[PDB]
Amino acid sequence: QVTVTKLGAHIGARIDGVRVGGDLSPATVSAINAALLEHKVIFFSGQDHLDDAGQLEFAELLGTPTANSWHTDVTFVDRIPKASLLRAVTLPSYGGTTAWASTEAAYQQLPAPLRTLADNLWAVHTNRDYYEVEHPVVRVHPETGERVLLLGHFVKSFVGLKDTESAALFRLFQDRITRLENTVRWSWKPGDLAIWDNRATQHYAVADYDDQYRRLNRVTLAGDIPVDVYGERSRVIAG
Amino acid sequence: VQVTVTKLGAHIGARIDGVRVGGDLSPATVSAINAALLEHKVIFFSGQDHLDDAGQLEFAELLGTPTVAHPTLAEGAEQLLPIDSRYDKANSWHTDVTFVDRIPKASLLRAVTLPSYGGTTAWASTEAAYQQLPAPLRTLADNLWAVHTNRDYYEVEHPVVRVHPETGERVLLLGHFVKSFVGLKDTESAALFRLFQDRITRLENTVRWSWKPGDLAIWDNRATQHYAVADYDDQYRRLNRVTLAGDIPVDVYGERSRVIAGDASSYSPVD
Amino acid sequence: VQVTVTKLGAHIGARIDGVRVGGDLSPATVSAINAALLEHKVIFFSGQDHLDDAGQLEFAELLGTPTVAHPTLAEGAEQLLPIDSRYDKANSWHTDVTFVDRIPKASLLRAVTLPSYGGTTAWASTEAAYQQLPAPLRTLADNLWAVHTNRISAEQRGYRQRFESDYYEVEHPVVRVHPETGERVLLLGHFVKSFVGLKDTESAALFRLFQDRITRLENTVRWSWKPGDLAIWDNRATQHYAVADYDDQYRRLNRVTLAGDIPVDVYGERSRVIAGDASSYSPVD
Amino acid sequence: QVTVTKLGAHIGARIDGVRVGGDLSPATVSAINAALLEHKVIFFSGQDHLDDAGQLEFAELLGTPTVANSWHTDVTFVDRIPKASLLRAVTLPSYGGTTAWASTEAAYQQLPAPLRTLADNLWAVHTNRDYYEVEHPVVRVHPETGERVLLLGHFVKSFVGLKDTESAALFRLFQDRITRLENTVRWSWKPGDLAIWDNRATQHYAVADYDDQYRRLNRVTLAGDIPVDVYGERSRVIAGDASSYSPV
Ligand SMILES: [Fe+3]
Ligand SMILES: [Fe+3]
Ligand SMILES: [Fe+3]
Ligand SMILES: [Fe+3]
């Protein structure tokens, strides 16, 4: 029995009733997957039994296993990872929250002229072992069919635009993505595990714990190559 | 009467020579002047020493229907507007009277009293600026609408891109009467306004004129903005303006401007 | 009665435990609460199931002088302000009532009725944001002044007519010296119309620049409300933001506000009232 | 007899009455120099006799000769920013090809006090991306006039100690004030024209409004000194060596 409890209007849900591990039924896995897609980031609590091997075994059921700043993970490659699982190991006595934003909700909220702009824009993403890729600013989510924004801090520029225009448009879209209403902010506790849809989110690791020691363990799941609204795929420039 | 046109810059501006400007010009001469205006956006006549207010107005009559001087600034029904340095310096990029539906199509401005230095006027081509837009920004402009106001309160929603009724060319319609873009947050209106205005006022899309006695400028207010430079300190400066009635902007899909407040019937007819 | 303070983040936020909040607390307890408030900027009490409007007000009385609810929104002379979702949602970064000279020093906000999801509130430290400024931007902030002013359904129009019934305009320094801590703090937020002596385009750019630094997630704490929760914040060293992420669900909190003093800039100059009179709203603390 | 005719309130003057060349009196040279410092860019006309050698001989009297559709000050990526340039028309397009200048002195005076002080305390990284990188003050004290002037333009990569987003916003704010039309003069070149500008108190912009018609002007540049800020601190070279370009 997988119960899903919404945390906010546009993003975030708690999951309850699941002892997380590699031995879950297909019904349970696909209910977890359904929640992930709908809510964008989901949180399990009380997973005291869970270790690295268990986290990995669990990850294997959801896909194929593989920063004080707003970003989507590893967008400087063509095959942007679809999701990540993050488990608390050692937490500071204060701070160390993480925030997520819905790039789906942000798109839906765009007025028509700005939607169409986003639909037609392409962005150069890089890691500066050099990677450079041109991604559409709007990609069609391969599992939900929903249109979602693809931006974040690996964006160097928008194709065909002056740098001053890239800066202004990037800020305009980012402002809409990171509006507090499109975000959820999680306070980590021991036994917590978060899973997010990296195709429909950005996130931000808040450095508000003064460099107290903090360890979480991440498993990342392979994704596909973004397709734009007209069927065009991302173009790898380097890497 | 030969009307010779000399280009001043790639995208905007021409001098006109060979015409004693007045109300007694042939249709061939008038339509050659009109053709130059549309192609070059602002045109300049010089040495018009004989020209007075009545002559300027008689000449204006041949190119269109003179407007009341201004919707709100006119003392009565007079067709001449004083551009007098004691009352204002329009030190800001704009298209004339865009807060009404019937944006005037053109203005004629004649030098009367000039400062010993400064007092230039600049014009920008809102046609060239559009052509220069990369495709995603063109389409954005094509789909944006702007609220223009004069704060007799006037408020009108115009398309950011209008199709020029005589040339068929697409041209930007912005300038300082824009309060906001319809449906957008104010921060987004500010950023996009600056983006488009930056492209309009790029020096390459502008011509800047040094006024001399006997000069007369005519500009296509559907395809330009202009700016009166206040670089003459406190010197007295007077030019006389006649404005010609225009039509209601139509966007790229055939939609017309939407009046929210005010009534311009008294200011001018629809041309 | 032990008052235990638990930090929530590096630059802002603490939980308070061990206090049954009310009007009958010892001076030691009150001053320990006050000390936590100044250090942590916003503090949170939980499990205050016994607490009602009268109790909240009795408690507020120990920490300062309650104001009239609001300069313009108050029906009369009542000290409680409804934060009611039918009338308004303050989905915007601000410091309370900065359009008067006597900016209230603090507010107490108690949960009454909560949505099943969302409805979080965030606070930012305008103290930490100042400390984090590089020297040239500090000196800029030190020398800037800002003009603050107060300018669908019937409930919503009422709210807005009432809010603006009288006009208020005041020039405040962008940096004020905190009268209890001595710390320099930014004073901005959404009542700012412009910066004195600057072009509007420059006011917009500088406002965004400073606000960006204030609202950086690192300088914020975001609270999930539960029944029995009560928040108290230092309105001299914060801004806050009511997040509208609960769709059309009903949400009510009750606010009591405490009288503050007139901001002084870094050179000893005080705020200059241009319009409005706040004598009726509150005294100067 | 050197007559100076103002072109605008804050910048620009025509010079008349001088056959420009290497054989001018000290009185004439220093009157030309005085006009340059006051007006920031000055224009001679009708100099049909003037050739490259003559332009250079004339330049020699005003300093030590050294040996862009975008607002800039020349060669600010070195410590020894050249003090001035002389530009003579050789071959002009039939239309367009204007040049504009802006006064970085007037722009400073016009700043409200808080923004002045900001400018007084800001430093900028200038580069040419032979890689050159130098940190210059945003406000320098002009060594001949004593007037404070802004030092920005398109070689600025960033402001020292600031986030890039802040550098972009402040750069645009100051540049907006510099290039305000009121602080500029725009010159229409004619054969026989020669312009001289004070590169310590200006920026300029070559307008590309002649569609790639052929256009030639000849430039001679005069060696300058190292900027000093409002507190006596000098520019800090991070990379490159300008000894070969010019002396101080
Ligand atoms: Fe990450
Ligand atoms: Fe005008
Ligand atoms: Fe509030
Ligand atoms: Fe140059």
Side-chain angles (χ1 to χ4, degrees), chain C residues 4-17:
Chain C
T4 61
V5 185
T6 307
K7 252 174 107 61
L8 291 169
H11 300 117
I12 187 171
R15 291 205 328 283
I16 308 297
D17 284 304

Side-chain angles (χ1 to χ4, degrees), chain D residues 2 8 14 30 32 135 173 179 195 204 207 226:
Chain D
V2 178
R14 291 205 329 280
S30 90
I32 286 164
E135 288 176 9
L173 185 151
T179 64
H204 58 283
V207 188
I226 299 176

Side-chain angles (χ1 to χ4, degrees), chain C residues 6 26 50-51 54 57 60 112 114 131-132 135 165 169 173 188 202 211 235 252 265 271-272 280 284:
Chain C
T6 307
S26 70
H50 67 280
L51 194 66
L57 197 65
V112 181
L114 305 174
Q131 282 157 17
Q132 280 149 35
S165 38
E169 181 176 331
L188 289 169
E202 306 179 320
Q211 283 296 132
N235 195 53
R252 177 60 178 256
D265 87 344
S271 306
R272 312 181 281 265
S280 202
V284 185

Side-chain angles (χ1 to χ4, degrees), chain B residues 8 10 118 198 204 206 208, chain D residues 7 96 172 182 184 186 205 209:
Chain B
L8 291 169
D198 279 355
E204 285 72 17
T206 68
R208 185 160 174 192
Chain D
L7 291 169
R172 164 94 200 209
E182 287 72 51
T184 68
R186 185 159 174 191
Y205 186 118
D209 53 351

Side-chain angles (χ1 to χ4, degrees), chain A residues 41 52 69 85 101 161 183 225 235:
Chain A
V41 61
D52 287 349
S69 173
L85 292 84
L161 273 49
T183 68
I225 298 176
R235 312 181 281 265

Side-chain angles (χ1 to χ4, degrees), chain B residues 90 94 96 219 226 241:
Chain B
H94 69 287
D96 288 331
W219 67 92
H226 58 284
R241 196 172 92 170

